[PDB]
Amino acid sequence: EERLETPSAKKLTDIGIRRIFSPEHDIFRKSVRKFFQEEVIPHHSEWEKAGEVSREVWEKAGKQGLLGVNIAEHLGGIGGDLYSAAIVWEEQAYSNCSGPGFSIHSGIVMSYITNHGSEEQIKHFIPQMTAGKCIGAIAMTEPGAGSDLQGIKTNAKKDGSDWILNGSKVFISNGSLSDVVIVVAVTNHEAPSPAHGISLFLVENGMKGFIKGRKLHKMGLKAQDTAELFFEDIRLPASALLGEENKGFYYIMKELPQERLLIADVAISASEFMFEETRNYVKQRKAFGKTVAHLQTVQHKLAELKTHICVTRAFVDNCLQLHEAKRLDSATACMAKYWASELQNSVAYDCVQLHGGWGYMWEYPIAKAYVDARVQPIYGGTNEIMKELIAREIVFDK
Amino acid sequence: EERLETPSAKKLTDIGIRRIFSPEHDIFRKSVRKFFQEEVIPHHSEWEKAGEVSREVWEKAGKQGLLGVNIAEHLGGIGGDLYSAAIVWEEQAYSNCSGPGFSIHSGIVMSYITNHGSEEQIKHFIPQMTAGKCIGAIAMTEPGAGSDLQGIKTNAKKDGSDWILNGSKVFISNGSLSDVVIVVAVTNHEAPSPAHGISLFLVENGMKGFIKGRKLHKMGLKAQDTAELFFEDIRLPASALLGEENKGFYYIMKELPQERLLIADVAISASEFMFEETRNYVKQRKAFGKTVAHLQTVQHKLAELKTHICVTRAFVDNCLQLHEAKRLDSATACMAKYWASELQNSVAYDCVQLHGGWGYMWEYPIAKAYVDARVQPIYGGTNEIMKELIAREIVFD
Amino acid sequence: EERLETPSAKKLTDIGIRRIFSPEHDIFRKSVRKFFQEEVIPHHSEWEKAGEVSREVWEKAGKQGLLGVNIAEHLGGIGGDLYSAAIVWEEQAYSNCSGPGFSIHSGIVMSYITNHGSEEQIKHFIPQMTAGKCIGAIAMTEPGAGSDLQGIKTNAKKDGSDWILNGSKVFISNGSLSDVVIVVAVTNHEAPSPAHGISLFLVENGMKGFIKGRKLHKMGLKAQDTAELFFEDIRLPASALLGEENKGFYYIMKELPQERLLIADVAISASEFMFEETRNYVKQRKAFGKTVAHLQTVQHKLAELKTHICVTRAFVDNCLQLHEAKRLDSATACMAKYWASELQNSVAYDCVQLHGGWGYMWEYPIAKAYVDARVQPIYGGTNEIMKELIAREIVFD
Amino acid sequence: EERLETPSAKKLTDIGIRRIFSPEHDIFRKSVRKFFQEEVIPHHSEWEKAGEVSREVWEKAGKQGLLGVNIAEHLGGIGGDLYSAAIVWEEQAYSNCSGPGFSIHSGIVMSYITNHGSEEQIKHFIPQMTAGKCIGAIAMTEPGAGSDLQGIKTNAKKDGSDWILNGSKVFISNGSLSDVVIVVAVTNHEAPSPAHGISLFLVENGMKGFIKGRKLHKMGLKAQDTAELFFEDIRLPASALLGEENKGFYYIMKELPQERLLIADVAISASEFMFEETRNYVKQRKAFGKTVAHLQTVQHKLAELKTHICVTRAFVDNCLQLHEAKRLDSATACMAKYWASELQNSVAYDCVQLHGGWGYMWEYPIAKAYVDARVQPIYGGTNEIMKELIAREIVFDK
Lengths: 398, 397, 397, 398
Ligand SMILES: CC(=O)CC(=O)SCCNC(=O)CCNC(=O)[C@H](O)C(C)(C)COP(=O)(O)OP(=O)(O)OC[C@H]1O[C@@H](n2cnc3c(N)ncnc32)[C@H](O)[C@@H]1OP(=O)(O)O
Ligand SMILES: CC(=O)CC(=O)SCCNC(=O)CCNC(=O)[C@H](O)C(C)(C)COP(=O)(O)OP(=O)(O)OC[C@H]1O[C@@H](n2cnc3c(N)ncnc32)[C@H](O)[C@@H]1OP(=O)(O)O
Ligand SMILES: Cc1cc2nc3c(=O)[nH]c(=O)nc-3n(C[C@H](O)[C@H](O)[C@H](O)COP(=O)(O)OP(=O)(O)OC[C@H]3O[C@@H](n4cnc5c(N)ncnc54)[C@H](O)[C@@H]3O)c2cc1C
Ligand SMILES: Cc1cc2nc3c(=O)[nH]c(=O)nc-3n(C[C@H](O)[C@H](O)[C@H](O)COP(=O)(O)OP(=O)(O)OC[C@H]3O[C@@H](n4cnc5c(N)ncnc54)[C@H](O)[C@@H]3O)c2cc1C
Ligand SMILES: Cc1cc2nc3c(=O)[nH]c(=O)nc-3n(C[C@H](O)[C@H](O)[C@H](O)COP(=O)(O)OP(=O)(O)OC[C@H]3O[C@@H](n4cnc5c(N)ncnc54)[C@H](O)[C@@H]3O)c2cc1C
Ligand SMILES: Cc1cc2nc3c(=O)[nH]c(=O)nc-3n(C[C@H](O)[C@H](O)[C@H](O)COP(=O)(O)OP(=O)(O)OC[C@H]3O[C@@H](n4cnc5c(N)ncnc54)[C@H](O)[C@@H]3O)c2cc1C
Known about the structure:
Helix content of chain A: 40-55%
Subunit structure (chains B, C): Homotetramer.
CATH superfamily of the largest domain in chain A: Butyryl-CoA Dehydrogenase, subunit A, domain 3
Active site (chains B, C): 259
Binding site for substrate (chains B, C): 147, 195-196, 250, 257-260, 380-381
Oligomer: homotetramer
Pathway (chains B, C): Lipid metabolism; mitochondrial fatty acid beta-oxidation
GO molecular function, one term (chains B, C): protein homodimerization activity
Bound molecules: acetoacetyl-coenzyme A, flavin-adenine dinucleotide
Largest interface: B-D, 41 and 41 residues
């Protein structure tokens, strides 16, 4: 059948558009949008004050079949393609709730394990993940080291068949409701190469030495339990280490593409959200004898935004298609992420200007999405880094 | 002697720079800065939680002589010039403490009373205000009528020498600590336009009928008590009238320039703080054996912000000199409010970025400047309005 | 089977990339790229000084079959899908020779006739237009009206089955070389709107009263013979009428999407060429020791550039596919022309800067590119008018 | 007394505004304006075709006191304050005639000579130059070295009390009409950094081995005779050396501030010209029944342009004031050159878009302007070099 293009639809969020989809995805959509209308938005204004969401919507989440959607079915996941697990990405954005740490779990942590883990490890965790009992997260950053992920200090020493973890990890998405945490740690301090001596681990909550810090007070993402994680001589087991020892950077390198494709879709989706939202506010808010939307200026400001969102959507869709065939390279990934997150902010700022005074009020969706979008250029690897990598191929014959 | 302009100064916020100031102005600014570092900066974290600052501080600022600076001294104010009052707006900006509403109080509310109010009204209010015992505020906006003042539904019917007040004003600053508020009320539903039937009233705290509503929840300005104000049949005595009846729109007119200059200067000043703050951060944050300030991309992103800040500041300081002389017209003040307020957010944004993760943390001074910055392009008249006005001398003849 | 996207390709101009082309298209693109390299590129400077290309290059283009790559084989064209016609648009842009007014001929005029004209007309023109012996041009814009098309004044009055054409057009492409010009004229001086009283006419070089004005001096498109046209009491035989009398404007709205889409792709292809040409320069230009491609700022700029270009490229290849399926509406068509033409200029500005002073010398491809680009946001309907339209579906019904 | 500022005047280009000028200055402005109105504008098209102005307009300029205005009266110049010199800069800009290379001549070359030249040099050149009978041109950029001024190859080696000059310089304004050219050349290859091994040389039209190359084809400055220069084993006497040996790079870094300040003023002045040409155009253009000036989008775009132009002018005049007092540093000057030249191209682009199809026809002032403006961000130090220097004092503490 003929699916319309985003620019031609009645709404950017309209279900049933964009050729990278099929009628089967249409139906899975109603469900995810419906699930949020009933299980997420109704309580988010309560989880924000809390500093995290309930563990109750996490089990409901898994029970519904939205966690681990693109994780193979013969491992403990629904076993769908990417074209549909991203619909879970997109839909959370179309609801404006940055509390639930779904994707950071479904699309990233559930992906490392099912991709670089061992028989024992897969079965131990993948079922819990899809279930909703085990909450995943990852800790790469350190208060003193960041984009330079080559200069961290956390480490796990060689003790018997055990690894002794020592360190701290600031800024961890879902660092309070965590059960399983993929911590990046140095195993070779004298490692002749920053890349050659970093290992991955799966530290589990309930261990001696693993303390969780208070929920970090941020300017946005008020409902995300970001917190500092500590490691006080945690005696890890032989099942602790993930992938080969001193080969962490290798497993990380093969995941980023996906991570950035995710962050990206969300950004643009979140943009399609604010657009239709802002479009509505002006199509009614009356002034100077009729509506603001009757003003030429606003009409042109609107054309500019819809055009920029549409154009970028085409790129993100195109990137999803590639990734389906596993032919989406690290660079093309960095483009989608970089453009989409920079776009999300630009759109947010303008969209708030359009509400005027009520865009600063926490009551309207847009104000929350403003401080919610200023985290995109900062995490997942700053957009300054995205340029470095993109530029790698341009300037050097590598 | 000779002074340096922001560009050549060791730091944009140094004391003793910018040619529109004198040695005396410098001495004063040093005082005001000290005040903020010790009587405001230390309590802000609490006020943010509080959702409002203390009357304690407002009154300390009274003895100090920061309230009513450019208000004549033979009228209850401390009677300095415009540069001196400007200094207090700038200094509050340099402390990154949005909580205190000092500016609106002496820059706006107190001007309205000393410029159009009555002799008896002056005696009763000015000194109380210069001391900070009577915190003043102003309420023009209404839920659906902000950038269109003619569409204000708050009205005052006549009843003897009394006026009955009814209506609802949203977004009012200091609507939790306000003792005297200037309300914009329609007094003549019968007139060629609200611009001919509006009056200003001095609604005091405690008049039966004046319900100070709940503090609104915003994304920034966490320590400035922003609230809704309700008026139910308030019995306003003759004395409440400020200026001539149905002349409110004319007085508002006369004051708007200064209101725009004030935001102009706060905005540029706010940008000045962020810049020197971010500059410092990149010089300390370590990356690759060296500092992130060694990067060429960063170096350039800084030259851009600084250049755009130094440039805008020049214009704004040129507008301060023009207002001193009472020669800053409506358009020019609009240009200042516009360019500076717009510039403020673009500076906020590029600045959070250079902070990386932390810029997001409410721990860093910047994150608070970011949310405290998204307000400038909106209040005091959206930039869209400034453009329409600026454009009147351009397009029409 | 598998094809890389511009991002992964070794160059955005590489033959054999982009999902919307069959291995058959590749082979074709190679002959066209060969055509411009060998038949256009070497003689362009000569045409630049002359202000118009040779008739030879046109005929050479008809023989190679580039004129009407998407006009029905049975009507007199060479047939082929839109993706093919596009290649000829794209390849020209890639040679950076805005001289040949090929696209307007093939993609527009040849299309107005095989879409609304009679068989006598179709038969009489289409064969020689593809052969490149008859150069066509479109002429609607006038001295006082372009955007607001219903504001024209060229009129056609009936005198028998004959037509008396009067008026003038300005900014007409392929103007001095045109043998055939589709003129837009008001036929019904009184109707609901000029939108319902407009007709089309095929004016032929030779008819008495058809005077070709002086060639125009422009900042760019130096080899594009842009001229002014004058119609002095022209008696057009009945066959001159193209389409149902007083329906023209409706015919025009139908073809606009094509025009916009065309511009869109020329625009982005130009940017593709430009980025590639600049990446080349920065890598072979040394300074302070290593090349200027090593400098971190030069990289990040290139990265931004490559991104915005690949992102736009996609949206355009999206509109090509859509137009192939006869499914490209006005708005979507508008988005492409607008976003792309502006991205075009922006890329040009940055690319010149990257060349340093050499980016100002006519000798380097980047300078013609800069001035040749400034026209896209203007013709084919101004970017403002593009928005006005894209905004209708957004705001109204 | 009460001089209006650019925002308040009836026009940005009106005479008698801006607080940095005296009533005397206005009289002088009227004089200089009439001169372009009558002596330059009327003949510019023909110089455009020719690729150079006439020696006669230079001479008419010299006899009427427009050359060497800020040059010492007693040394040969007319002896006016910086502001008068600037007035000439500005008026040439207001006329939209970038043909006459007067600014480089009076503003750059003549300053170099009277600043670091001997008494014999001053007497031998200044009076001719103020008389427009001796045209000046500076030449330091080369086919392989521009931004990297420390990378030039042009050199001179001593031979008795003579110097042997060899090399080539590109992009030399006034290169065609020049009678004297200050040539930057290396005089000491063994210096630690070539910054200490450079010297200035007064090459004179006619010296053996001094060849004027091909007059360059550009996208703009069609009437500015920019050319390529050659020096093949020239025997320079001792007098030829301007200033002291190896102290060349020093004399230059000391003059740059004036080069950039001048470019900054020309830039913003060009922006004022374009504003008013366009304002007046949109106001007299009919479309859809009303003038285009009436379209709200057009008023805001115009309001933006004006505010940004008035704001930069404010910075620039403040910079002229500082320079007159000799207290304008390298960094400030750079901020000015940078911001203004960028704004110029920005304004030119918008202004062309408002003229519509006419802004592309050379017949219209705005077209000369758009192309003529693209060079400002490149010469006198590329805007990127401008940032390099501005950042220097932001990131480095004494
Ligand atoms: C590469 C190149 O070099 C090519 C070139 O530059 S050649 C020159 C290109 N020129 C252009 O593109 C001209 C640009 N102008 C336009 O697109 C339009 O004039 C415009 C966008 C400015 C809008 O003009 P407008 O006056 O608002 O037209 P609009 O409002 O749509 O007119 C309404 C009418 O359209 C009519 N209409 C349009 N298409 C119709 C159709 N197919 N069937 C029936 N009616 C139709 C409606 O009936 C409607 O009737 P009314 O006037 O009674 O309401
Ligand atoms: C319209 C027109 O006509 C305008 C034109 O285009 S004319 C030509 C315009 N050309 C330009 O503007 C060239 C632009 N380039 C430059 O200005 C410089 O090359 C530059 C800004 C890029 C800096 O170059 P650089 O190689 O980094 O120089 P830099 O590193 O600062 O050199 C350091 C030295 O300067 C020396 N220095 C500078 N001025 C000095 C002085 N006057 N006395 C003593 N030392 C001085 C310092 O002692 C220092 O010594 P070290 O070698 O021990 O470090
Ligand atoms: C809400 C939120 C959730 C997050 N969740 C996680 C998580 O779950 N796990 C985790 O480990 N981290 C997470 N982070 C942390 C985040 O990924 C890091 O803060 C970010 O990737 C790097 O920030 P930094 O300050 O450490 O980088 P810094 O090194 O401090 O960089 C500071 C500035 O210098 C710039 N700079 C440094 N190097 C370069 C360069 N090479 N070129 C140009 N500029 C450069 C940076 O881009 C940035 O602009 C999260 C952050 C936030 C805000
Ligand atoms: C935190 C905060 C503090 C404030 N403090 C005060 C205060 O103390 N006292 C007070 O009275 N008010 C104050 N305000 C209110 C503020 O001044 C008003 O919100 C503002 O003046 C008008 O915005 P609005 O909410 O009325 O939106 P509206 O004016 O209804 O709509 C504005 C939106 O439509 C656009 N629009 C409107 N008109 C035009 C136009 N003509 N052309 C093009 N676009 C247009 C605007 O640019 C913007 O996009 C404050 C507001 C906030 C948020
Ligand atoms: C080199 C070149 C080749 C061209 N070839 C052809 C050709 O072959 N045949 C042909 O007929 N034309 C052609 N044109 C002309 C071109 O199509 C028109 O110039 C253009 O479509 C409209 O410009 P205009 O001259 O009508 O300017 P105007 O329509 O007068 O517009 C002037 C300014 O007002 C703006 N404006 C107008 N209306 C609005 C509005 N409603 N809202 C907001 N802003 C508005 C315009 O965008 C512009 O900023 C060509 C132009 C050039 C330069
Ligand atoms: C019309 C015209 C007239 C001129 N008149 C004169 C004259 O009369 N006399 C004279 O000698 N010169 C003159 N010039 C030359 C001009 O000053 C130089 O072209 C300019 O200063 C440097 O450009 P370039 O050609 O050296 O480019 P390059 O310096 O070779 O390369 C410049 C490109 O690389 C970038 N780049 C280089 N270094 C850095 C850096 N370190 N960091 C970041 N980016 C960098 C530049 O920003 C730009 O993108 C003129 C030039 C033109 C165009």
